[PDB]
Symmetry: C2
Subunit: 492 residues, 2 copies
């Protein structure tokens, strides 16, 4: 028995698979999203833990398994979302600032002015943006009432939704995080596999609330007995996206996959060395086996399903499902393009001033059309990244693996394939982020080795591109022109 | 009684007024809007005639009046829609190409290449653009069987809807039109107030089919008795927008109004002579009294009402009404802009290529926000034309006189007044367009003098600007940037 805790942005998921990867039971529960000011996204650190546990138990229940059975535990969470809490009380000193926050922009701009941008893109493989937790911390570490002094001695502890779980699972016992969940932090160096002293100072943030660089398969303590009902070993902790890449069995260099949830994240296994992109892609760690690391190229797409989501929050569709009924009723969009950049643009543009844009509306533009446009937008963005990775060092992408909330929409995937002109495959085990977690755990616990994950992976289906080359490219030229008109809307 | 026939874009209305410009009864019926291809707009001539005939009979019924009681009849119509019919049978030989239609863009660009635009611009006061009936004629002449040769035979008749209504009203006995309608066809010299051969030659248009031009208060024959029960003197013919200008009583130069229908048309009285504007405005005939002509500068906006109508079609609202209650629920759009140019931009941009564009969408953008943006979108359109009229060959606009289906929304007018920084005023008699045709026909029957008109004009409300200049200019600035992002989206 393997147990994975998948802490997502919109809800808490718990899955108890076996040792070969098959799932036994599932329990999911949403939790209020805090919207302080526009562009601000906050999460109640309590609302989170009361659902990561509520589901850990719910699975065992719906399964009929007792905790004593569980071999190891696997942790997969949101990625950059940052928290700040007191070690003693174990209490949140301020709500959670989600990776979706668009507040630290000015700083990124300042730090960019100081000429530091180059030092960070070649060290952390990232860049200056309100996405990563780096600036997300400085804000809290200089804005909450009088918090910057408290955390000068160590009384305060920082942590990504992963280290936060480790905490709540060991009542203050173990305080740490895996390389990946940290690679997506502006402080972590990806060459030396440990935080860089310079960076920490470069932002003034004290190395006094930082977790420990434990590999994703190592030992992360043992859960509290009264929580689940027995001591469970946790040998797996990994950023959802990096997890989802491991669950898709993308262990080969050149193997990539894309997950479609609130947003969309495309990662490509780059092997031993990190591909320091300059076109707008991020270099990051996929996972760390007892020490060594395998890197990847990533394309972050802030908005994906939220595209349809927004369509719902305005009544263009009644419930979220008709999305593929309307879009399906029309062959095209009538030359309409919807650029879903609500909170700015991700990859490979990285434009904080871009906003949601609709284009080419005519007296005859309809709901079916808008529905299809929302779906295309997401796919077009993925192509932007796929094309970016194609020349940012490497070969042609032969296949693209998919999983996540949107993958359930068959139509969407066919559209993805057509606009990419490349086959798109889905696995037999849909809860991939979870499986990625569980497996990593069983791997750290000596149960299964990585080679046990590849020959155990199974493809359920795949959608083939039926759209001719001429058509695909005309559409792409339209979309790219569409994106040029969404850029820089915010006054700057 | 003075009877007025307002043959609009969507429906045919009929109003019966007292000699003192007070409505007695109203009859309104709709007709089918035909959309053969995207951007194409057609009318069934018969349906147009039959509903007009129908409304005319219904007001007479509702008022308990009889034809003999009607002193004179005044015609007023949608302004550029083209029709062709057999002189012998009166049967139309192709659906009427409405003013909204746009199929003729290639010809416009073709005629602009030959370098003809300047010549036409100084003779007609127009410009090349699908809008005017000139290119619609050309289109018919080279896209139909052997129409070209048929026209040259003399058995074919051309005419705008006024000419159409008049031909049916007299059983073919009168083929005519007036300077205001003729000045929206591109084949009329507005200086000498006559068809210009030089122009007819340029477009390859035979003269054998042009109708006779008579003044606005001329004699257009009498109606056949069978129709209304007794022959009725026809002494009023005026383009609809020129009519509303007369009905608002804007007889002195510097006085303007704006009717808000499917589209919105602003007209400014420029007195005894035309004002050729190279800055994006039209120069047309306000009306012709016995020969002495009056001119006005115009601004044509193709989409006003439809902006809300469209929201209705895609289900963002539930009826053209809820818009107000909906937009009222918020103070601002959230930095979200709506440039409602489904079929391109009117004045002063005249960009066939622009399309409907929504800018500044964010995660939390609501239905109210879009509702308001649509309203602000029409008002910003008006501001565009006013600043052109104004900061140009003109003084300053003191008051903007309103009317039309959209002026029945106080919120909108208030908004329009704010963004405009000018007061806006609605008249007591809402059926302004119709009241204009009747008053003109009144001046034709001798029962009235234009001096009577301005004396009897009553004003209902007046909405005062309630926004500071700073805020006003700040918003306009954002709108101008929105228009740019909307310009030229289609392929040239």
């Amino acid at each position: 028995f393997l147990l994975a805790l998948d802490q997502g942005t919109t809800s808490s998921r718990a899955i108890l698979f076996t040792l070969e990867g098959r799932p036994v039971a599932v329990a999911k529960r949403e939790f209020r999203q805090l919207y302080p000011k526009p562009g601000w996204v906050e999460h109640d650190p309590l609302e989170i833990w009361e659902t990561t546990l509520w589901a850990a138990r719910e699975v065992l229940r719906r399964a009929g398994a007792e905790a004593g059975e569980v071999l190891a535990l696997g942790i997969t969470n949101q990625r950059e979302t940052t928290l700040l809490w007191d070690r003693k009380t174990g209490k949140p000193l301020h709500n959670a600032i989600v990776w979706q926050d668009r507040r630290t922009t000015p700083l990124c701009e300042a730090l960019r002015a100081k000429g530091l941008e180059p030092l960070f893109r070649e060290r952390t493989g990232l860049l200056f943006d309100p996405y990563f937790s780096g600036t997300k911390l400085v804000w809290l570490l200089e804005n909450v009432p009088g918090l910057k002094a408290r955390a000068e001695g160590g009384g305060v502890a920082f942590g990504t939704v992963d280290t936060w779980l480790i905490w709540n699972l060991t009542g203050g016992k173990v305080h740490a995080t895996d390389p990946t969940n940290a690679s997506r932090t502006l402080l972590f160096n990806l060459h030396t596999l440990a935080w860089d002293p310079e960076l920490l100072e470069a932002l003034g943030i004290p190395a006094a609330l930082l977790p420990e660089v434990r590999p994703s398969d190592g030992d992360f303590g043992e859960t509290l007995p009264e929580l689940l009902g027995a001591p469970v070993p946790i040998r797996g902790v990994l950023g959802d996206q990096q997890a989802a890449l491991f669950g898709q069995a993308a262990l080969g260099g050149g193997e990539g996959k894309c997950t479609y949830g609130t947003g969309a994240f495309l990662l490509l296994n780059t092997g031993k060395r990190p591909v320091l992109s300059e076109k707008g892609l991020l270099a990051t760690v996929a996972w760390s086996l007892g020490g060594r690391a395998t890197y990847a190229l990533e394309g972050s797409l802030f908005v994906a399903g939220a595209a349809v989501g927004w369509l719902k929050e305005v009544g263009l569709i009644r419930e979220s499902a008709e999305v593929e009924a309307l879009a399906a009723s029309v062959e095209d969009t009538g030359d309409v393009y919807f650029v879903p950049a609500f909170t700015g643009l991700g990859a490979p543009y990285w434009d904080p001033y871009a906003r949601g844009t609709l284009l080419g509306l005519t007296r005859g533009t309809s709901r079916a059309h808008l529905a299809r446009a929302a779906l295309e937008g997401v796919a077009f963005q993925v192509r932007d990244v796929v094309l970016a990775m194609e020349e940012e060092a490497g070969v042609r992408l032969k296949v693209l693996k998919a999983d996540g909330g949107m993958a359930q929409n068959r139509l969407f995937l066919k559209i993805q394939a057509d606009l990419l002109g490349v086959p798109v495959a889905v696995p037999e085990v849909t809860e991939t982020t979870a499986l990625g977690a569980a497996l990593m755990a069983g791997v750290g616990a000596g149960a299964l080795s990585p080679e046990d994950v590849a020959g155990r992976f199974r493809e359920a289906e795949r959608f083939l591109p039926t759209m001719p080359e001429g058509r695909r490219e005309a559409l792409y030229r339209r979309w790219r022109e569409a994106v040029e008109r969404a850029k820089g809307w915010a006054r700057e």
